Design a protein around this ligand. Structure first.
Ligand SMILES: *[C@@H]1O[C@H](CO)[C@@H](O)[C@H](O)[C@H]1NC(C)=O
Length: 319
């Protein structure tokens, strides 16, 4: 019994975790990441992004991504590959470049084709385009939007599908898990890609939530079904629930309830294929400076010891 076994019993394809290459020298860490009772799927937190894979123009660098795939392969875990086109973690040669539509499309397509071809057959899913929207539902004024216009999004999907016709292609974003202008805009991006005639198989809902401010199971489920209704599968792709510090028993209990609701929403939704937590131990959680004051976001603590949230996830998965 563990998260992945429970998830699969309920019909999900996996419960899984992200990781990153600096953690892999920690053999105790790796032993639990490799426990397929809890994790049937791995995401590389950083080593398949554009800054990692094409840090200078045309210079593809796959060793760190390959090391994560090799670990997953050894363990019999699925991969989700993350992420091709994104405004963040973009090398300066792209973000600062002097582009025309043709020249940026060439470089963007070259990035996709090379990365996706290299990983052909190794990935369950690709996050093809990440965080294309602002909070108010406008397009982000990234280099792609400013130079190419909205077509960059369906072109990226079409390019990925040409390189690897069978991997599931996802649009991934945060703050699209509750209703609002941003979730509506994410729906409209799905419709727009499909109308262009490009393949989109999934919406990735990052699920970076806050303890005590997490959307209810009911709200989350409703929003998932708003996506599945458009003809895509859905997954929670980067789940973590940071709490306002310091940690307390009451907050740990609330955090358990919050995680429980997310797992239950997925299990309740036909077409929700799985949940990936954004790493699994607080020691390696993602808490950048903009969230100073928050922390302890994950189901195991910094000592690799389960927190109440682990039991909350199990309950939410019906175990
Ligand atoms: C860039 O080229 C694509 C592909 O033909 C097209 O859909 C889009 O409108 C173009 N954008 C600009 C700004 O010329």
């Amino acid at each position: 019994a563990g998260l992945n076994t429970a998830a699969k019993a309920k019909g999900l394809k996996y419960f899984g975790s992200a990781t990153d290459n600096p953690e892999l020298t920690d053999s105790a860490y790796v032993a639990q990441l490799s426990n397929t009772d809890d994790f049937g799927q791995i995401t590389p937190g950083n080593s398949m992004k554009w800054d990692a894979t094409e840090p200078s123009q045309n210079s593809f660098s796959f060793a760190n991504g390959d090391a994560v795939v090799n670990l997953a392969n050894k363990n019999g875990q699925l991969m989700r590959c993350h992420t091709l086109v994104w405004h963040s973690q973009l090398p300066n040669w792209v973000s600062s470049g002097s582009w025309t539509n043709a020249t940026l499309l060439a470089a963007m397509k070259n990035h996709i084709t090379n990365v996706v071809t290299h990983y052909k057959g190794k990935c369950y899913a690709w996050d093809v385009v990440n965080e294309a929207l602002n909070e108010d539902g406008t397009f982000r004024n990234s280099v792609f939007y400013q130079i190419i216009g909205p077509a960059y999004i369906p072109i990226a999907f079409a390019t990925a599908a040409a390189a690897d016709p069978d991997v599931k292609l996802y649009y991934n974003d945060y703050n699209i898990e509750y209703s609002g202008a941003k979730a509506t805009a994410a729906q409209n991006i799905v419709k727009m890609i499909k109308a262009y005639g490009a393949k989109i198989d999934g919406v990735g809902l990052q699920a970076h939530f806050i303890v005590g401010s997490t959307p209810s199971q009911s709200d989350l489920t409703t929003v998932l079904k708003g996506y599945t209704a458009l003809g895509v599968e859905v997954a929670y792709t980067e789940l973590d629930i940071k709490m306002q510090l310091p940690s307390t028993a009451a907050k740990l209990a609330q955090q358990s309830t919050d995680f429980q609701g997310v797992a239950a929403a997925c299990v309740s939704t036909t077409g929700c294929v799985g949940v990936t937590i954004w790493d699994w131990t607080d020691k390696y959680s993602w808490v950048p400076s903009v969230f100073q004051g928050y922390g302890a976001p994950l189901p195991w603590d910094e000592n690799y010891v389960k927190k109440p949230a682990y039991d909350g996830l199990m309950a939410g998965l019906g175990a």
